[PDB]
Amino acid sequence: QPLRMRLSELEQRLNNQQNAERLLSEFCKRQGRQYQAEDLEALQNELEARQEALSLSVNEGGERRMEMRQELEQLKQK
């Protein structure tokens, strides 16, 4: 009887392992083709850094482009 409960629990563990493997493969195929599935936390950190880069780039581009557009307005009045 102990082995019966062990069997059920282990079957659920196999289920979760296949879930993780399938999801890993599908992502690693969607972005990349085989993308360090063994330890992928570092890529999450770098992608967060690239989101910070997103904020920086978008703000800088917007403010600079619109400021030089205002310079264009000054030139137009001139």
Partner: protein, 61 residues
């Protein structure tokens, strides 16, 4: 001043191209990041590449 307008138009084009490209690229990066931190946020460590293969033995027991 018309020379200035010409060069400024070129620079406006460059700014617009750069902002568009960067926002698209980092947006796709954001989507991939969210898929990772949704589906497998350290779930790989729960998996741990164990490959238990012991259900057969439990069935024999």
């Amino acid at each position: 001043l018309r020379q200035r307008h010409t060069e400024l138009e070129r620079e406006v084009s460059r700014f617009e191209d750069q902002t568009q490209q960067q926002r698209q690229q980092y947006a796709q990066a954001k989507e991939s990041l969210t898929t990772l931190n949704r589906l497998i946020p350290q779930v790989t460590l729960l998996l741990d590449e164990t490959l238990i293969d012991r259900v057969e033995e439990v069935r024999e027991e």
